[PDB]
Design a protein around this ligand. Sequence first.
Ligand SMILES: CCCNC(=O)c1cn2ncnc(Nc3cc(C(=O)NC4CC4)ccc3C)c2c1C
Length: 339
Amino acid sequence: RPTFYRQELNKTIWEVPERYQNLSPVGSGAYGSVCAAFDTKTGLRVAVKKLSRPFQSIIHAKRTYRELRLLKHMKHENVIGLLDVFTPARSLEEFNDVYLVTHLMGADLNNIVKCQKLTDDHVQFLIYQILRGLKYIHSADIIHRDLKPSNLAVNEDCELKILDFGLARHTRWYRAPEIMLNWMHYNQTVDIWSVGCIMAELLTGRTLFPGTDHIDQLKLILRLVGTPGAELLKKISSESARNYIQSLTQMPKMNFANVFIGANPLAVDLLEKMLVLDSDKRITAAQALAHAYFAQYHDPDDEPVADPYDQSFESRDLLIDEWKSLTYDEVISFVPPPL
Ligand SMILES: CCCNC(=O)c1cn2ncnc(Nc3cc(C(=O)NC4CC4)ccc3C)c2c1C
């Protein structure tokens, strides 16, 4: 147990140990507020997330537990890790606050692309790194479901980290069409759609699909991928959507050569295999890595798959004290990473 201290940061109380020096609200992080802090027992520049009412609800309680378990398992370079997990709690019948810690990067891929367009080598390193992150996440049977530049954290030396994974359920701009229109059974390839919306954007400095609603967004989608054909229009079941498509203007597929003008031929080819409207035809994270474009970066011997990750709790219906105890048990039981 360490020396604690109580401070305030923009209308909220922040109870954090002696070691966590200098704090500052850097931006909007999933579930609660995040702070930029400077460590001591390691002495680095970290990010600290204070969860918003983590146990106030059955949703919040099942989502507090979920995250703490994803980060206690994710040991891969381009995947967000867990440096520390703390509470000001003396007991379990007190424990109603949770804070998780990990390194702070330079900027996110959204603030990177704003200033400005990135060459055919920056892109090679960034997409490779995104997908190599995805491959580790995926083999542990987790999908992202909300992959977009803002959750893709990067360093000055271009080294990448994926954020806010495995939490999403129930940005649309990088969201897969089948998960947005409820067309098919769906799989881990909804993020493979996201990377092609990201890739293309680092290659043009232009949001591929800056649509306005579920209707405008999709109209922007076909406006590039061509209306579902004879192979696809059979597969879709969704009575509303299945009847909705055949009532749109007949559009052809565009040439990704005549869209991404000047682009390295292999980028055009991989993009094509990314914006496929067939969730079963579409390429996978591991498949995408063995593509000629990543010839120089790719080495299957340094692209690892994850240690088995237990999701048995994900179908479970438990009470708040049950969850609040499971998380408490995981908070107290965590052991720092080895240097
Ligand atoms: C200087 C601009 C760049 N800033 C960053 O590097 C950076 C921004 N953020 N924003 C939110 N959470 C972070 N970290 C974080 C991420 C998760 C996370 O990704 N959750 C996984 C979904 C289960 C959980 C807790 C925390 C503190 C984080 C980091 C590191």
